[PDB]
Design a protein around this ligand. Sequence first.
Ligand SMILES: NC(=O)c1ccc[n+]([C@@H]2O[C@H](COP(=O)([O-])OP(=O)(O)OC[C@H]3O[C@@H](n4cnc5c(N)ncnc54)[C@H](O)[C@@H]3O)[C@@H](O)[C@H]2O)c1
Ligand SMILES: NC(=O)c1ccc[n+]([C@@H]2O[C@H](COP(=O)([O-])OP(=O)(O)OC[C@H]3O[C@@H](n4cnc5c(N)ncnc54)[C@H](O)[C@@H]3O)[C@@H](O)[C@H]2O)c1
Ligand SMILES: NC(=O)c1ccc[n+]([C@@H]2O[C@H](COP(=O)([O-])OP(=O)(O)OC[C@H]3O[C@@H](n4cnc5c(N)ncnc54)[C@H](O)[C@@H]3O)[C@@H](O)[C@H]2O)c1
Ligand SMILES: NC(=O)c1ccc[n+]([C@@H]2O[C@H](COP(=O)([O-])OP(=O)(O)OC[C@H]3O[C@@H](n4cnc5c(N)ncnc54)[C@H](O)[C@@H]3O)[C@@H](O)[C@H]2O)c1
Lengths: 423, 430, 430, 423
Amino acid sequence: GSSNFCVKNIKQAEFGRREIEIAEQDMSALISLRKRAQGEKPLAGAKIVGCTHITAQTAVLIETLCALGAQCRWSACNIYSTQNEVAAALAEAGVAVFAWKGESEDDFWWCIDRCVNMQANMILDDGGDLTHWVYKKYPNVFKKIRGIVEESVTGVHRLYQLSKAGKLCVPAMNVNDSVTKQKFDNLYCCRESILDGLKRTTDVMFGGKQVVVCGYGEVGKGCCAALKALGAIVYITEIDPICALQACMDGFRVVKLNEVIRQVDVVITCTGNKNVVTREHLDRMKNSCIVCNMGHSNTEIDVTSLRTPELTWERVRSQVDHVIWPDGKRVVLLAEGRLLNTVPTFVLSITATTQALALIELYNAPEGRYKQDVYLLPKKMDEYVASLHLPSFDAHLTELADDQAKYLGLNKNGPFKPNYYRY
Amino acid sequence: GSSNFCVKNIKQAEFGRREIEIAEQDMSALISLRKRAQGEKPLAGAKIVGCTHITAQTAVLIETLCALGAQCRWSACNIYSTQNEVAAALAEAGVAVFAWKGESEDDFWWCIDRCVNMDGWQANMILDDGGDLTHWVYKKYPNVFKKIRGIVEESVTGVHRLYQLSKAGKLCVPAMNVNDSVTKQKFDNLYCCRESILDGLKRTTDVMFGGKQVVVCGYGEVGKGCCAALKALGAIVYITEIDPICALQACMDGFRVVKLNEVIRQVDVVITCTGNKNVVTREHLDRMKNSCIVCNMGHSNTEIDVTSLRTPELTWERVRSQVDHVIWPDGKRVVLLAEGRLLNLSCSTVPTFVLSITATTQALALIELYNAPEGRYKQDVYLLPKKMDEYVASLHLPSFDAHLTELADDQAKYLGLNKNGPFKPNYYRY
Amino acid sequence: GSSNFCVKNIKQAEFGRREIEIAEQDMSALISLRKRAQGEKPLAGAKIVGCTHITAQTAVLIETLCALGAQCRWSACNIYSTQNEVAAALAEAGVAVFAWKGESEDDFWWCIDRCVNMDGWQANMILDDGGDLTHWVYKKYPNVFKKIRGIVEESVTGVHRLYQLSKAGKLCVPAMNVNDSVTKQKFDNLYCCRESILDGLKRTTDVMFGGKQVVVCGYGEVGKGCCAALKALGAIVYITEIDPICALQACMDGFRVVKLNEVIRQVDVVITCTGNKNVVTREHLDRMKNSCIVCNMGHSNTEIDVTSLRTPELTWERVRSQVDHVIWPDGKRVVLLAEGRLLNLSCSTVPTFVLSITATTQALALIELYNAPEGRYKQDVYLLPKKMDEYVASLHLPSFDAHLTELADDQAKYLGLNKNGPFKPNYYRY
Amino acid sequence: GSSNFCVKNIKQAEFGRREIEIAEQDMSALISLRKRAQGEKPLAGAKIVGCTHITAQTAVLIETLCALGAQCRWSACNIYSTQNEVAAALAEAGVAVFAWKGESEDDFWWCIDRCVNMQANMILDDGGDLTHWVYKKYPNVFKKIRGIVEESVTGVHRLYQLSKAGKLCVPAMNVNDSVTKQKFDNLYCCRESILDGLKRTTDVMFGGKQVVVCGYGEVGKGCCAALKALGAIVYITEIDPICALQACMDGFRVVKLNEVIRQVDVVITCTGNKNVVTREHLDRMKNSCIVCNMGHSNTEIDVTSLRTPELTWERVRSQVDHVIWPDGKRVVLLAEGRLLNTVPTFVLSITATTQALALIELYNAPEGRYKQDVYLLPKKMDEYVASLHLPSFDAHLTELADDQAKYLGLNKNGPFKPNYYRY
Ligand SMILES: NC(=O)c1ccc[n+]([C@@H]2O[C@H](COP(=O)([O-])OP(=O)(O)OC[C@H]3O[C@@H](n4cnc5c(N)ncnc54)[C@H](O)[C@@H]3O)[C@@H](O)[C@H]2O)c1
Ligand SMILES: NC(=O)c1ccc[n+]([C@@H]2O[C@H](COP(=O)([O-])OP(=O)(O)OC[C@H]3O[C@@H](n4cnc5c(N)ncnc54)[C@H](O)[C@@H]3O)[C@@H](O)[C@H]2O)c1
Ligand SMILES: NC(=O)c1ccc[n+]([C@@H]2O[C@H](COP(=O)([O-])OP(=O)(O)OC[C@H]3O[C@@H](n4cnc5c(N)ncnc54)[C@H](O)[C@@H]3O)[C@@H](O)[C@H]2O)c1
Ligand SMILES: NC(=O)c1ccc[n+]([C@@H]2O[C@H](COP(=O)([O-])OP(=O)(O)OC[C@H]3O[C@@H](n4cnc5c(N)ncnc54)[C@H](O)[C@@H]3O)[C@@H](O)[C@H]2O)c1
């Protein structure tokens, strides 16, 4: 007699778990953590309020969190990402899931509500919308929270905003910038997928072409290397002298966007800033110049300055518009300045383990370890995330000998690197 | 008319000054740091006791410190490294330099001590490269040691010595780890792990690595550089690790993580870059196939238990410089490079650009700790501030004619950042 | 007033001409070849029968031929590829074009035949892309076929068809293999094997290859490109080969050469790029581990015996476009892409620069064979002359603003070479 | 009672063969060819006159050639390269070896003599000095020769000179440009070793530096890729439009040497030409610019124009001179314009097998297969060279199935590629 949930369940729980069964086969790292951490119950009594994508992979995390003794009350962090069939499966398992595909902005806040009120220990968030809603609607529930586990870039920025500015009164965990997760998201975004959206939408070869990549951070470094590999001539713009010196040494020219704006075939933004590519820059670009945002939002390129009456827009294909100037000049604008963009199950597994361990760490943390500030996942916990993914490669880790562990000032299991280690 | 110096240099100043003049054209980033902060004398009142190599490059650092108001008393960190000519030009310039080429072990500790004690001289700062001068001030003059405003250390073992006193509470003075400061760290990594990583190995071997099987022990800065270099030449690289993060990094970089024994009998090359002792033991050396190459790109000479190969049944043949063939009674030989030591310690010298990065880091690390308020640094080892790291990088940008973009008021408002202030958070790995 | 054309285009010429005008800015190398050889009309008297895609790029080639004095009669090599608008502008320009989008198999052979026979028209040259027009002239009009001055073929199967007649003595006319001409070959290799090699695979899969085990069957142009691309992402790549040179190349590039069976049960991805039949047989598909990906980057759809997977005990589920999950009775599924066909044939189009290289090669291959003296080419298939290959490359250099160095009389005397003549020997692989 | 030889043998034959025994262990590809081709005796009666380096590796080829039924009369192609101890070992084995270290230019031609006259079938050469000596001293012995097997660049050029110009009246084998050998020499020279001499002698890092590589052939492509990998900014000069287009597409600028001569930190020649870097170029180079020849001879850079009285030479280290101009400007000249430069035993094994099979092919060739021209080693013979080196990697070659070999128009063992194949 299941009541505590809100999904559009049509006996979908039988099919829903069958798609989770496939996901469980693909994320054997969490099932190992489930098996290894079982019995001990490190989340015994934990009342977790979650807000993330309701997918078959996520179910493996929620069903793992609940298997380690936690009370799961959940919501969807997006109004279209909910895999209703898996959501309906979670409802039958006992998980208080309030989520469906095609929910409105009112249904969205309604689900976050039914998730909070009906003594919530912890909050697992992806976005920070649930965290901010508990910050302006239930502040006495908020001050009693043991820890906020955040995986989103903006959500974590919102937490760093509260901190130091005198507002954060609860210890937080930045899992986005945590070592094992950051490094793995870097490999997927900046190494593997970096030019997939750009190659998919353009049908030109980058060999022998001139490109300008704005920003030489994670995305910029990844982008330039991939473009360099293809035989493209790449130029870089930077505000950070460390990143600029890094570009110089990597055989790239560090320029001001205007020095190359008139000759480059392709313009790429990956800064996280606004008005990097302005009206003046789009006016100086040579005809057919590809304009691409590989950073955030749609403010990196001032696309709003191209809606004026003299310019005309012609839709070439999906996610490709031609913005034509009265002199006949056209720029190939990809996805209206938005990031072109399903995350691989192995990437989610890395994130899910980091999130799971971040909850176990903050929940069982002593009163004096974590102050009212944002923190990264402990080094030994970061090592545990990596270790749980090693059997997927049949990787044989070496154990330190008693004299070896005595030589280097460290424990046979303990943190192997200093705090400032960059990997 | 001054006699406050000890050099062999019998009017070698004129010639030596020309070498500093030549060096100053290559240390253009230090001359800028000199020019930009002079007249404001940020080291006015600093009494610095130094122990580093005396070269025409180092001399530019010593003189930038003297130009920023500091009063220097210098020593050599090595008994062979001293370029006497520059030591003269410095002594003639007024710097209290106490060094020459061809020192004995007793002369080495005489000079170090000459820096520490003098009538009316009390040291503010210690700039070391090795830690030997620091261990000397710590044990010979503990009362002077407690009164030092800050230690700036270059060396790996010297910094680890400083980190050891911390967590043991023997460190009563703040320390600056320049070795792991971003700009300096990233630059050494590029020199050591990217550009030079196979130089020593290629120089001493005369085989091609393409098509070969190599086992690299450790996947840290050196291991990563090494494996990339070997991957690019066509070598099949196997990795051993104790750290599951570094091992997962290797799995994701296309390498298999194995226990040393799983491949020891099939690899053509064995490389150690751990910083550990007995990574390759007698057991491993015995199981290696004939013509296997054994190399240490890590620390000291204890990564491979070379002393276990000094048994009467084994026969040593130096076939080339730094190359020994250790032949077993059954005829099997292992090609052992530099007797288990790092090869680069007996091959070449550090590029002036790498020296420029380091010297700039050192000068700013001394300017920081000296002018630092209390409570900003306690009795611990710290890394160079981000705005200082950025400045080290910025001073080296004109040599590439780099054009840095400056944030607009609207742009710098969007990010919670200063137009010229720190651009990255503390946990930024770059 | 002419009616010598068959197009659907009801005054579509004005619009279509604008597309050729747009294309001519991207085919700048052909406009130069046009401009440089015009007035000298090297194709004056050539009666060319063509069968290629009708696009605004191809139209620039057809018009360069008509501008060099040639008289053209064109057909489409595909029943879907025709851009009708350009077909109008060409018909209006005077070219005898016989093509439109949405042809039936019977319409396709009607147009091909319309090109071949006409009152007072006898073909000098055949420009094909597929070989279907060549097989048609060879069997329907053998008397016209023996009188053709030269065949210039673009396609892989068309060229192999031409190479088959040779050594069998059925080829009575000289043929130009543009597919394996240096400039064209090196350019396709860069597009197909370097730039696009994993595009189809990345588009249809949603997994990361870094850390995965991949077996690539064949280490030719495609296999080499593929393995490099996979090596760079962090994948562990295994190679299978029949050719010991290509296998030794893989051994030297850091890959293990294995028999397909040695790794079939452990690989995450299987790739075929051989050009052979039954490289991956039912036995292999049965031994693949659950979630294995099967991809064909070779020819047709016979490299993987997909027809052996159409048994009643196997269940097919199209999870995405061009992605089928073939599930066994025990639950094990294999992710099979494009039903064993090449993915690129249903994803994108060929870059205009690649088209420019090819079109330039084709025009010069027709200028060569038409103006070629007898005894220079016999009843065999030949590659484009070196000085012509150099010219194809030279015509594309200004788009990069390349500055070619010219040999001095002393320099060109030192090497047995002409200042502008052939620069490399015949066996030069580049 | 050994007489037919000329070495400085002091019972060195006992130690000599012990160094060959080590070499035999390292080139098991030739011992396999020795074993496989034994019994058949494809060189039965062959009277080979050889001129190459007398090393422990070479001994394995000579002792293999003689093991396949050939009569070995040998000389040294260089006056300093002879490993006397191995030469003395060959003398005892029955090989007519006339060679020693430190022989004069008169001793050199004397040894080539005692090698020819005492009915020589074949000639195996490395240089073409022995081939030219049989061309101007014994022309009736020369016209009776079945084939010339040449491995040297200049020696092969000398043969291509005779051919077409109406002088070559004997079929030749170009083993230098033969597929398996060319590709393997390319890997050693242009991939593995390309920057070893330059890195060894300079002590600067190439990251962030500007380089000019003159020529984009085998050496140029190899050099630029290695420099590109290190983060250097590389520019290229070319005379060949195919090679120039190749550079463009590889993300390099194709320039005239003068456009970059004043800004580049490093100048590299790999053209095979003379006066690429002239007096005018060395006068425009910025102070400390490294000048390096990676091509041929010492004529690529006009070093002879820097001996004039206004310039001064200062020897920095071994193979590094500073050429100082009166204005104080200095250029770092490496090895007086000469190539900086022991070849690995696996490379020699590839060459030795190609040479061995080139001799078996031309000796047993029918009268009508090879005319009076220079040829490359047959494709199936090239495949045999590669196959014999595969067990060193434990490489498992796939055998074509009867229907597979029927599908592609080829034999289960025959040439797998067309003649124009570039690999
Ligand atoms: N493309 C993707 O797959 C993807 C994925 C996740 C996030 N992002 C977003 O992309 C942006 C960049 O991500 P990152 O991880 O590379 O960040 P990062 O902080 O590592 O790098 C951003 C870089 O841009 C530089 N920069 C900032 N303003 C600039 C300016 N206006 N002109 C030139 N350079 C400037 C910064 O100094 C920094 O080096 C962020 O907003 C990030 O959230 C992109
Ligand atoms: N080769 C060079 O040019 C060079 C230069 C400077 C310093 N070093 C020295 O080399 C050592 C390594 O340098 P690094 O920069 O790589 O340091 P690092 O800490 O970044 O890397 C050391 C790695 O070795 C691994 N490791 C430790 N014990 C192991 C074991 N026994 N088996 C397998 N792996 C093991 C660790 O997990 C770590 O990742 C240090 O002592 C350093 O001082 C070498
Ligand atoms: N992927 C693409 O974009 C693309 C593009 C054009 C053509 N192709 C086609 O793909 C096929 C291969 O192209 P290529 O350019 O690599 O040709 P290629 O001849 O250069 O390479 C084929 C390789 O496959 C090897 N091989 C043959 N049978 C084998 C076997 N059964 N097992 C293992 N290896 C085997 C051969 O030794 C040869 O090296 C051709 O039919 C070609 O038309 C693919
Ligand atoms: N560095 C080494 O390890 C090494 C080894 C063997 C031989 N070589 C010699 O080096 C030279 C180059 O060898 P390769 O195999 O690269 O030859 P290659 O024929 O493959 O390339 C030479 C290139 O230089 C270009 N070129 C010729 N003259 C030029 C000019 N004056 N200006 C600019 N470019 C010019 C040619 O077009 C050609 O592309 C040859 O003499 C060769 O014998 C060098």
